[PDB]
Amino acid sequence: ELVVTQESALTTSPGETVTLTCRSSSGAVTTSNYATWVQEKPDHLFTGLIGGTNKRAPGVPARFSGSLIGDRAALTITGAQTEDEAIYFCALWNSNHLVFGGGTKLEIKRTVAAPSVFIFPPSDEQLKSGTASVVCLLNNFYPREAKVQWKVDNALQSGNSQESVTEQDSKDSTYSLSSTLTLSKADYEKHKVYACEVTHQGLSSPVTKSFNRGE
């Protein structure tokens, strides 16, 4: 059972050279494996980049090239651009079959950006249905690491919130994050102050956004 392995994630600055590798558990990756690279961009947009180890596909920017380094197949990007933010998969041919690697997220580095933070109280329409969702938005930040803490009447919330982050934006190189606190309507009516508290490297001290129920 052939397992192809790639680095999970790499970070590079614009203009810098970055090298993605692809190794095999059968032994050395060789020319006979016909290494291919595929790029995946958001909305699952796939582009074949390299075939036969080091043959660039028609239409693919010269910036990309493929080769072997010791044991492994390699995709080099010479002068990474912001639009190169993507997941890159290599795939080795073997016997008849083709086997994909697990993929490598390529993050393009940029200067630290603090999030804008917003809190949304539940709509009057949701409250009619018996539940209440409070949403917190962290918009356009870098780097990705970010803590969100929910508090209700100053009490730290635990295990009743969920969280979701976008892929790196291909233009400004930022991330955004959405968090939802769910409680029942009855529990929502028992408390006044709903706060979303956010720590991030770009903030010199945490930002809190809050609202008062029925105000």
Binding site: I50, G52, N96, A114, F120, S133
Partner: protein, 224 residues
Amino acid sequence: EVKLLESGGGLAQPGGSLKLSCAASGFDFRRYWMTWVRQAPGKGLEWIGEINPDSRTINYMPSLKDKFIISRDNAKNSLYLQLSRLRSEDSALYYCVRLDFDVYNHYYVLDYWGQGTSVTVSSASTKGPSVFPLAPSSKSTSGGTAALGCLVKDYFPEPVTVSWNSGALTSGVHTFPAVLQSSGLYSLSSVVTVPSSSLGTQTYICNVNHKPSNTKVDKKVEPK
């Protein structure tokens, strides 16, 4: 353009079968090898198999054969994938992919990919989403912007498509990855940020479609 339109996905019950299909245009389909690839949620790519022009060489991923049947109909420029003995592990996006062959150059690339059709294997029933506004406030601005959005809540299965003002509004938009709640139902939010002073300047309507339950909703998000 090259086009590869998949269809046939949706909800299937465990044990049951399903037939995906894929219609091609913009190239001489007769001449090209074709491939199916799939991607389970939050996971990597998995090659399923390939078929040559005359349907005489059909290679499969061995570790799951007697399960997927690949065929093609060159007169209809169409590729087919038959799924049987369905399990939750088969839940994925299935991609129709064109393989460019080149024996002289020593070259085999998966060059054009379809957008994919979603397959979910579950005995759970379909559920349409409720759509709730995330109202903006002139008083709740941050980083020179106002935020507004839609909470698309309690649906099954994936996916929902969301857009703003019938696709006319794209700057500032973020649709977040859906989250799976402890109820077993999905939830997602979509937001728009705008410069603060532009808030009253235009109407914002999020359009939410959920094909499995035939739900279409247009929700106006009034500043409030």
